[PDB]
Amino acid sequence: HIGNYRLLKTIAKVKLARHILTGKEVAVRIIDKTQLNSSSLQKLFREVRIMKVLNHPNIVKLFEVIETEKTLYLVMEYASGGEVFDYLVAHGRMKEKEARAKFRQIVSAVQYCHQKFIVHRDLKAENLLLDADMNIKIADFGFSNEFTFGNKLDEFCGSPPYAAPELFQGKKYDGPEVDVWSLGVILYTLVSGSLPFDGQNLKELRERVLRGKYRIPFYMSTDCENLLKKFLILNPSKRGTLEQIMKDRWMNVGHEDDELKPYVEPLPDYKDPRRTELMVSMGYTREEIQDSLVGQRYNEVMATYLLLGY
Template sequence: MTGSSRLRDEPHIGKYRLMKTIGKGNFAKVKLAKHIPTDREVAIKIIDKTQLNSTSLQKLFREVRIMKVLDHPNIVKLYEVIETEKTLFLVMEYASGGEVFDYLVAHGRMKEKEARAKFRQIVSAVEYCHQKNIVHRDLKAENLLLDADLNIKIADFGFSNEFTTGNKLDTFCGSPPYAAPELFQGKKYDGPEVDVWSLGVILYTLVSGSLPFDGQNLKELRERVLRGKYRIPFYMSTDCESLLKKFLILNPLKRASLEAIMKDKWMGMGFDDELKPYIEVKKDLNDPIRIEKLVQMGYSRKDIEESLGQNKFNEIMATYLLLAKKNVDVSFGLYVFYSYVRHIFVFTFVCMFMFACLCIFMCMFVCRYLQMPFFTSLCLFVVR
């Protein structure tokens, strides 16, 4: 069987070649896939719509709607949405470093310096969501992914929702060990405060490698969360402990805002600048180089303009966005290549200069020793 026929026989969705399964749920699975036109790896969440009732379908389409408006370096990006009668495919950024949970299992707790770098990224991304009136509601180590450079990528917005001032939410969401006490009590909540509590649990987990609240069963866990008591490890700094106490407060009204958290002493240690709310950079959807590449691939300029102008999250937009990632890699590769050539050139020039200096020195020596003119001795040296 030839390589091309083997590729044709492999499972495909649109322009993507499906590879291994990297995640599984009740009605969905996540596959690693390769975008054939750009050769980029992506993650595709495959949801069986036939298994969902109308409420679950509404929740699913809300997740898609929310992911479409999020554009932050520490949030998994949505590239394309493919829908058939029975299935929904969400093509997303692939975070090759895996889950923070697995990272902690493999490496143990983080030193505070490493935890701080990761936590700043997490807080920045969650605060950005809150800016957009979006609450995640399922923040936990399993939903924090790492890219190839170990940068944080927040994933799984399945429980996320929009919130507005004065309109309370009432759904118990997320993983119980990360859930705020008011959720266990069945109280209504505004939104951001439940994420703030979960962030406190995450900070504790990063620094200690364990959960602040745990139990043999849900009843025991609930009791511990409602007491709000947790053990402070002996190795945790007083500054980190002080920050934790701003998150893990039983009264949601007294929990710190993320803007205040950003200004905390522990958050800024080792960094020149205070962490500030993320200012969204407008997507560059008018890059002539990438547009020309799309034309070369066979897409019409009209379709390209329409897809990018209307943020359609279709095949064209996905290819455009993935070309940007590829260009970064290519540019970096060219930079490395030219740097290498430049260093070789400089080294060669220095060697030639030193050799020329040596020749002149030898000629001067011969000139003095044989008492002949300098030019004559130089000619004799070169001929030899």
């Protein structure tokens, strides 16, 4: 094993693991640096930094970073509930009351990143993970657990049906309004268990996408069809921001007093007495806990700390 972790089984090389001293499960991406060229190494560590800066409850967290001469271990949040894509396959559509619960979390998460000028650019159901409580954990925001670095044969499973029309018109695919279209598509698959735009191949899928028409089922409320109209607009400049969309009726149904808003980064969690104590009586010194959590080292000490929060 590596660090305070016991590799259990595997699930791009990713391992399920048990933090020995907390018994908490964790995902452990393993990456071989010798097999990387400078251009790719840079992009990696650049994305590792992005992961260290996104502190949101629906964006899979990073717990530790172990880096050796030839290897880089990335210990991150494991989501025991799997993909949103797999769920939707089994249980079919969600109930209007169920989707809203998660679609709030999603839009809050994506919105948070747009604040920092990070657009995800590949939003899909396969990238929305769930934990043991049915809470949303978006993945691949920074570093991607699905994309190898040019070596392998990526299949881009699930990416096309959520692509905005710009992609097929040769127009730029850069701005936040791109995640915005995809959110539309996402929402639609949640309340229907199906695709607004579909086809036998990429040709047919394109045809349907660029036309922008999509069937609304009978069982879909009228407040819902009205939320889709705000996402699936063909012209990128007329698609509204996410701050403007959190103020929708369908979004806030059941939250008459609890209206959705641009998430506010919570203050640095680093001094919790309960965990500082629990740690000391494991064999951690007081100030190494202090230095580790002050400097946000993301080492074996910071990892243990964060893992005690579950």
